[PDB]
Amino acid sequence: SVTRVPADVFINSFAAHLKNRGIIKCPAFTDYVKTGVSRQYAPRDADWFYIKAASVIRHFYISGSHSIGVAGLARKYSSLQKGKTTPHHTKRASCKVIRSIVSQFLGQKLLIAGERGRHISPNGRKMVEDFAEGLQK
Amino acid sequence: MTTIVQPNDYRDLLRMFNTNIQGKVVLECALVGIKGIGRRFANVALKKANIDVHKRAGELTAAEEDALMKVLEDPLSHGIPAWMLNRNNDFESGKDMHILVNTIASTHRADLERLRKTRCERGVRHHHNLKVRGQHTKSTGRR
Amino acid sequence: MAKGNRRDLLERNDIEVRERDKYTVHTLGKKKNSVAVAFVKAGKGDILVNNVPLALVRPEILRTKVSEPIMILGESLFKGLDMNIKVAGGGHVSQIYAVRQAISRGVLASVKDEAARSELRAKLVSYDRQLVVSDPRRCEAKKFGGRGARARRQKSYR
Amino acid sequence: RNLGSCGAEDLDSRVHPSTIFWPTEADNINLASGMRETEFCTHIAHKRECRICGNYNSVYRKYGLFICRRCFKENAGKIGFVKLH
Amino acid sequence: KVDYPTLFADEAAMNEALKFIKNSKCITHTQICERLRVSVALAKRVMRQLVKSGDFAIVSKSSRMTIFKNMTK
Amino acid sequence: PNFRGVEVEKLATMKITDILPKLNARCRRRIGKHGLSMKHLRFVNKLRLRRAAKIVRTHLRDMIIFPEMIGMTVSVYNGRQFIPVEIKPPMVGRALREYSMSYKIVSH
Amino acid sequence: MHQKYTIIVVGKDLKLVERYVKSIVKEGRAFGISGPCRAPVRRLTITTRKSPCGEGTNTWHRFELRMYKRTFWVTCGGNDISTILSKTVVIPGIQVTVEVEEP
RNA sequence: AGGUCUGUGAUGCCCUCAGACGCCCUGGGCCGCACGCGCGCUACACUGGCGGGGCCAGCCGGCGCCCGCGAGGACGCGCGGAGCCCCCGCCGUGGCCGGGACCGCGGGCUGGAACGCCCCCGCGCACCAGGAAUGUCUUGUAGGCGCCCGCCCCCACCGCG
Numbered sequence: 001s002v003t004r005v006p007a008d009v010f011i012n013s014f015a016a017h018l019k020n021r022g023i024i025k026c027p028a029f030t031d032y033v034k035t036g037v038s039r040q041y042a043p044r045d046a047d048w049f050y051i052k053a054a055s056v057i058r059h060f061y062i063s064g065s066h067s068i069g070v071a072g073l074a075r076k077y078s079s080l081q082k083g084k085t086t087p088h089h090t091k092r093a094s095c096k097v098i099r100s101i102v103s104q105f106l107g108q109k110l111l112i113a114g115e116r117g118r119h120i121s122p123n124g125r126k127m128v129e130d131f132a133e134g135l136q137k
Numbered sequence: 138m139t140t141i142v143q144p145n146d147y148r149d150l151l152r153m154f155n156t157n158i159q160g161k162v163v164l165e166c167a168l169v170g171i172k173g174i175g176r177r178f179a180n181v182a183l184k185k186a187n188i189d190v191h192k193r194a195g196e197l198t199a200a201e202e203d204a205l206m207k208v209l210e211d212p213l214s215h216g217i218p219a220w221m222l223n224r225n226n227d228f229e230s231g232k233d234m235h236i237l238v239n240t241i242a243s244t245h246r247a248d249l250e251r252l253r254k255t256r257c258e259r260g261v262r263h264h265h266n267l268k269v270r271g272q273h274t275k276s277t278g279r280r
Numbered sequence: 281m282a283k284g285n286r287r288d289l290l291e292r293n294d295i296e297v298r299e300r301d302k303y304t305v306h307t308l309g310k311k312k313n314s315v316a317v318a319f320v321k322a323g324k325g326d327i328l329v330n331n332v333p334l335a336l337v338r339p340e341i342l343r344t345k346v347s348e349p350i351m352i353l354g355e356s357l358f359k360g361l362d363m364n365i366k367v368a369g370g371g372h373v374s375q376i377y378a379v380r381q382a383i384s385r386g387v388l389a390s391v392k393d394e395a396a397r398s399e400l401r402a403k404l405v406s407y408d409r410q411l412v413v414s415d416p417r418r419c420e421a422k423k424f425g426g427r428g429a430r431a432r433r434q435k436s437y438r
Numbered sequence: 439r440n441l442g443s444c445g446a447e448d449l450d451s452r453v454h455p456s457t458i459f460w461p462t463e464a465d466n467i468n469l470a471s472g473m474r475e476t477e478f479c480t481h482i483a484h485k486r487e488c489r490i491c492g493n494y495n496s497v498y499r500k501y502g503l504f505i506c507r508r509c510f511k512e513n514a515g516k517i518g519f520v521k522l523h
Numbered sequence: 524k525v526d527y528p529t530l531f532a533d534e535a536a537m538n539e540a541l542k543f544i545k546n547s548k549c550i551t552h553t554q555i556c557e558r559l560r561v562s563v564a565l566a567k568r569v570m571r572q573l574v575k576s577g578d579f580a581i582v583s584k585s586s587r588m589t590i591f592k593n594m595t596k
Numbered sequence: 597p598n599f600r601g602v603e604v605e606k607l608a609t610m611k612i613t614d615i616l617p618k619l620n621a622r623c624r625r626r627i628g629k630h631g632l633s634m635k636h637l638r639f640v641n642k643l644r645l646r647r648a649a650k651i652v653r654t655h656l657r658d659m660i661i662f663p664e665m666i667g668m669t670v671s672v673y674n675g676r677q678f679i680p681v682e683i684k685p686p687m688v689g690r691a692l693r694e695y696s697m698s699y700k701i702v703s704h
Numbered sequence: 705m706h707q708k709y710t711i712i713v714v715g716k717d718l719k720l721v722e723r724y725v726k727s728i729v730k731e732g733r734a735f736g737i738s739g740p741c742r743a744p745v746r747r748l749t750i751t752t753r754k755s756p757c758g759e760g761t762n763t764w765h766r767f768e769l770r771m772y773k774r775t776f777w778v779t780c781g782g783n784d785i786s787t788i789l790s791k792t793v794v795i796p797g798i799q800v801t802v803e804v805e806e807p
Numbered sequence: 808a809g810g811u812c813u814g815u816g817a818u819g820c821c822c823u824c825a826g827a828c829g830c831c832c833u834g835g836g837c838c839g840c841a842c843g844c845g846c847g848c849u850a851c852a853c854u855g856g857c858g859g860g861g862c863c864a865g866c867c868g869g870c871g872c873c874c875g876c877g878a879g880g881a882c883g884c885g886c887g888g889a890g891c892c893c894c895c896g897c898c899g900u901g902g903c904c905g906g907g908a909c910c911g912c913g914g915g916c917u918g919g920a921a922c923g924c925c926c927c928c929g930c931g932c933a934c935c936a937g938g939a940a941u942g943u944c945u946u947g948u949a950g951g952c953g954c955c956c957g958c959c960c961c962c963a964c965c966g967c968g
Contacts, residue, residue, distance in 0.1 A: 003331055007861055008894065032181050032221070033876050035859095037926075041176055041904090044191075044858050044897070051859065069871055072887085077860095080890070080953090083907060085849045086964055090889065090953075096875070116871045116884075141568055143532045161529040161562075163897090166904060175929065176904085191897080193530055220876075223929045225913050228686075231600035231618070233912095241930085245911065255686055258694045265701060267840090269910075271922065275840050281864075281888045312947080313864065338862060339893065370864040372892075417947045419865090424764045424967065431949070434942050436845055444641050447611065453631035458919065459960080477832055482919090484960085491815040498750065500957070507752050508814040511765065518716050519750065519767040526901075553853095556899075563899045586895060587853090621914060622921085633919060655833055658920055675835030693922075698834095704841050749866095751957080751967050757811040764967075 002061060002132045011058065013135055015050035024053055024104045030097075038079035038091040052077075053101050060111065060120045061128050067117035070098050138191060147195045153202075154238050160195025167194045173237040178221060182208055185215050209237065282368030284315035289368055292317055303364075305389050309382030310414050314369035316378040320386045323362025325355070329379060330366055342376050349384045352407060353400065357387055377410070384411045458482060465489055465504055527562050540569065545578060548593050599685050607685055608666045615663065619689045623660055643668065653678050657693050672696045706781025707807045709788055711738070714773050714802040721772045724801050728776060731791040736782020743773040 002010065018024060026049040034042055035052075045051075059076070060068060077093035102118060105111040112121040151158035151167075158167045165179045174182075183190055186204045188197075208215050212222070212235055219225060222235045224244075228251075236244060252260035259269055268274055282289070292300070305320035327334045337343055350358055365382060367375045384404060391397050405412055426432040463486040464470055487494050488506040496507045505513075514520075531540070540559055544550060552566040570591065573579045579591040599607055600618050607615075616627060626632070636659055643665060646652060653671045661683060671678040672692050681695045711728070715721040725740055732738035748769040755763070779788065788805060 004333065004336075006336055006894095011860065012895095029876070031184065032177075032218070037877060039858085041857070042180060048859065055860065067871090071870085075888080076862095078889080082856095085907065087848070088890090088953085094877080096877090099873085116886080139568065141531050141565065141572075142536060143530050147530070147532075163904095166898090169904090173929070178928070195530065218876090220913075221928060223912070225928080226600070227912080228600070229598045231602075236912095236929090241911090245930095248911075251686065255684070256695065258697060261697075261701075263910095271838085272909090273838060275838080279840090279842070281868095283865090283867095341893085368863090372863055375863070415947090419947065422968065424762070426943090427966095428944095428950095429948070430944065432943060434846070436942085438845095444637060445644070448637045448640055451612075451627065451632045452637060453633055453919080459917095460919080474831080479831065481832075488814085493814055495814080496958080498957085499959090500750075501748060506814060508756050510750075511752065514750075514767055517769075519748075519769050521765060521767055523766065523768075524901080527899090529899090553899090564897085566899095625915085626920090630919080657834075673834060691921090698836085699839060702840055749956085749967090755810085756814065759810040762966095766967090 002058065002128060005132055005136060007058070010132060010135065011051060011054045014054045014057075014131055015047065017131065018053060019047065019050050023108060024050065024101070026050075027100060033097075034094070035077065035097065036079060036091065036093040038081045038093070040083070049097075049101075052097065053105075056098070056101055057105065057110070057120075057124065057128065060118070061125065063119070065119065067114050067119045069117045070095050070102065072117075073098050140193065140196060144196050146198060148197070149195060151194060151197070156238065158194060160193060160197075162194055163190075164188070164192050164194045164197065165190050171238060173223065173235065173241060178235075181217055181221065182212070185217065209235065284313060284369040286368075289315070289317060289366065292319055292366060294366065295319070295364070305386055307382050307386035307389065309367075309378035309380070309385065310369075311377045311381070312370050312374040312418065314367060314371060314374035314378045316365055316367035316375070316382045318363055318365045318382040318386045320361060320363050320390060322360070325359035326362045327358070327383075328364050337376070339372050339376065342373070345376055346380050346383070348380060348408075349387070349404065349411065352404060353387070357390070361387070361390055377415075381411060381414065388412075460484065525560075527556070527560050529562050529564060531561070531565060536569075544569075544573070545593070545595065549590065550579070550593075551588065551590050599688070604685055607688075608663055610663050612662050623689050626660065640664075643670075651680065657691065657696065659692055661688050661690055661692070663688060674698045705784055707783070707785065708777075708781065709779045709783050710775065710777035710806050711779065712773070712775050712804050712806075714771060715800065716769060716771055718770075718772055720798050720801055721774060724795065724798055725774055727795045728791065731794050732776070732779070735787050735791060736780065737778040738776040739778050741775045741777075743775065746771045746773070 030049060032042070034040075035048075056073060059073065071092070074093040074095050078090055079093070080088050081091050082088055102111060106113070106118065109121060110124040110127070111118050113119075147160060149160050151160060154171055156171055158170060165176065165183065168174050168179045169176060180190060182205065186201070186208050188201050188205065213219065213233065219233050222233055223241075224236050225233050227234070228248075249260065249263060252263070262269055288294075295303070300319075303319035303321045305318075307318040307320065309316040309318075329337060334346060335343065337346060363383070363386065365379055367379055367382075369375070369378075388397055388400060391400070401412065420429050422429045460482045461484075462482060463484055465486075485494070486497055486499065486504060488497055488509050489504050490509045490513070491506060493506050493509075498505055498507065498510065540555075540561075543559060544555065550570075552563045552570070555561075555566045555569075556563045570579065574581065574591070578593065578595045580594045581589060582592050583590050597604065602615070602618070612627070616624060636656065639654060639656060639659065640662065643652060647664070647668070651669050651671045653673075655673050657672065665683050666685065666688075668683055669680055670683075671680050672695075673679070674696050675698055679696045681692060687695070713721065713724060713728075715724075729738055729740070748771070750765075750767045752765045752767070753762070754765050792803070792805075
């Protein structure tokens with residue numbers, strides 16, 4: 001399965017695949033935003049959106065039957081606020097970008113809702129696993 | 138990147154807005170040497186101008202240098218928002234601009250004059266040099 | 281998030297019930313607040329931690345630390361059997377050590393010949409003793425004179 | 439001064455008919471039920487106080503107690519709080 | 524105080540740095556920085572070129588530090 | 597000598613609601629949401645009557661300034677003394693606190 | 705008939721709570737079953753200055769109130785409206801041990 | 808003759824008692840600043856800073872959807888856990904991308920009421936490991952890293968853990 005391969009190669013390989021295959025696209029507001037109040041400058045790569053997308057889908061697959069809300073994901077992308085001559089404190093990430101990603105995924109039926117939150121759909125499991133096995137070699 | 142050798146047109150030290158800039162620094166951190174430009178505003182400006190950002194400022198051909206000027210006097214047209222600017226809702230014309238060198242010093246001087254003749258608390262305090270915000274004096278802050 | 285003493289862990293209801301009954305052995309490891317539960321059975325040499333193999337545990341440098349008993353005893357026994365560990369409690373390193381303790385203790389229980397069990401004990405404890413015997417020391421409480429268990433607030437005489 | 443009216447412009451700007459948030463604190467239903475009377479006690483504000491000695495300082499609201507720290511050590515044993523560990 | 528460049532001024536790359544390094548058994552980014560008085564980044568780029576060519580090879584790698592061995596002898 | 601592009605001569609005799617969207621967050625909150633309280637409204641009305649028809653004294657140090665209060669003189673309290681304030685456009689949208697000092701500068 | 709009734713008992717001291725437990729288990733073996741659930745102990749904590757004035761060494765009191773709770777919901781349909789009463793009056797009447805019954 | 812009559816329907820003797828030291832209202836102040844010192848917090852960098860990703864706690868513990876760069880907001884239900892660290896890259900000894908005080912435009916929250924607290928763009932102070940002098944510490948300890956409660960309309964560089 002996906003957990004039998006290191007997370008590092010899967011994420012970036014799958015991001016490239018996603019970007020090639022027109023599944024998702026970076027909107028316009030990406031050209032001038034951070035990913036959190038905790039941050040300080042903007043990302044240095046031009047393809048950070050698809051990295052986030054892949055990490056998210058992997059998160060959704062891991063959980064399985066469970067359901068994940070947007071903010072709960074945003075607590076997995078937190079950091080630390082520095083530069084205040086005051087003890088540092090942890091802060092939550094952003095939610096607009098996460099929301100856009102899940103909406104884009106759900107419009108493709110890779111992701112399905114429920115009583116609360118969303119969870120992976122069988123098609124998502126199919127594609128994730130087939131890609132993982134393909135890169136297993 | 139993959140620029141090892143100085144290009145034939147490498148320009149060892151750039152002058153712009155009366156300030157001078159060196160060509161060994163990466164581009165977006167050199168412009169920070171201007172007064173009115175920082176990290177956030179620079180990445181945004183260059184990108185709109187189709188300029189590489191991880192480049193040494195000495196390989197900045199003048200063709201890319203001029204288009205950059207064209208974007209720092211009329212930035213709002215070029216797609217940049219209005220919460221990213223230095224001066225939002227000017228006190229007179231009510232518009233929004235970005236003020237670079239020389240403009241800042243003149244602008245800062247006139248507000249104090251506005252503050253002085255109007256007879257506020259801040260203006261009187263500025264002229265004996267005290268804390269303007271509510272940060273406490275007395276303790277600490279001594280020779 | 282996990283708590284170690286939860287009933288949902290000690291019984292390992294994670295496994296499905298028809299498969300939960302093929303696991304004969306049971307085992308425990310621990311270190312600090314960390315606890316690991318192992319369900320050992322018969323197979324052909326496969327190990328898993330939180331649904332992840334042993335080669336891809338995360339601190340990277342300690343992979344040898346968890347593989348120790350294999351290269352000590354030898355791979356014959358482990359090749360004979362198949363295991364499925366699950367751990368939950370404070371810290372990456374604590375989890376590592378708890379896991380290795382559980383490995384060793386469980387493979388010790390698989391053999392029924394007490395004599396061999398004692399021989400293996402001697403073979404293994406000599407190299408290290410925390411592979412069988414849990415480390416007892418645990419975090420200690422603080423007092424109101426200061427911001428530490430034994431440190432005190434600085435005192436100004438004049 | 440009932441015959442006192444104001445311009446309509448100066449009427450819609452008036453605060454919306456909303457109950458002032460400051461509700462005070464009624465430790466028990468007994469202690470209330472909702473010239474000088476115009477301004478006897480119009481400054482409504484929380485007035486939480488010890489239910490023993492009536493002081494407005496250092497009042498443990500935790501657990502719905504409302505007992506001063508000083509007025510507490512005495513009655514703590516009766517209540518059931520004990521000192522161990 | 525001291526300053527070092529970030530970009531090689533043309534013939535400088537080959538008339539020395541390439542020559543010098545090729546006559547070294549072991550090397551690192553920082554050594555070469557301190558040796559011929561250039562910044563570290565240029566060292567990174569150059570060593571990339573060279574491992575591509577084949578003279579040097581990696582023996583230990585890591586984000587903080589990697590070290591090479593001269594496979595030309 | 598303008599005000600957000602608005603001409604001064606027009607600025608006076610204008611209603612607050614016309615300019616409110618061209619003010620800061622505090623004013624918009626206080627007005628559009630928290631409304632206003634009765635005594636302030638009577639202070640405004642008294643001002644109107646005086647204009648239509650002596651320095652107006654008061655205690656309100658937290659009273660935002662309206663366009664109809666241009667060129668007026670009003671005396672406000674520091675905690676001990678009543679202090680005149682003369683209004684002019686650039687003083688609009690602000691409280692009376694700034695223009696009445698409760699202390700004096702410290703000279704040793 | 706069947707009313708899914710549940711028994712909850714609360715106490716601050718651990719000696720009667722266990723005594724009440726035994727009586728109930730003894731008296732509910734017939735009217736169905738009544739096996740207990742022991743809850744995590746809710747411990748109330750209060751830290752106070754030992755001094756009324758704030759003088760000398762800063763020394764602190766450490767009070768607490770442990771509250772123990774047990775829950776027999778095992779009656780269930782095995783008890784009728786009157787049948788719950790039977791035992792509840794046959795069990796000892798310890799002075800302090802709050803009890804509430806709900807379906 | 809240590810501290811507490813300013814914790815109390817604990818109190819002796821004095822003082823105040825209808826222009827009140829009683830009680831209630833409106834404002835101001837307790838925070839003001841040429842100066843001496845006590846407990847703390849943040850740093851002086853490569854055994855590091857920035858950007859991206861992976862991942863585990865305990866006293867214990869609440870969440871979805873949609874707007875908004877964000878902080879926050881409108882609706883609707885009962886459900887739920889992090890920093891250091893590890894991996895990949897950029898910077899390259901420059902008071903520099905170290906450090907984040909001060910100041911100039913702007914957007915919001917609490918509240919009857921901002922002088923209070925949060926977020927965004929720009930400006931970018933002292934500081935190169937600290938004299939005479941001095942404090943604390945023996946195993947899950949020192950130190951480093953963060954997380955909860957108390958007081959609380961809002962707010963923790965404090966305090967208990």
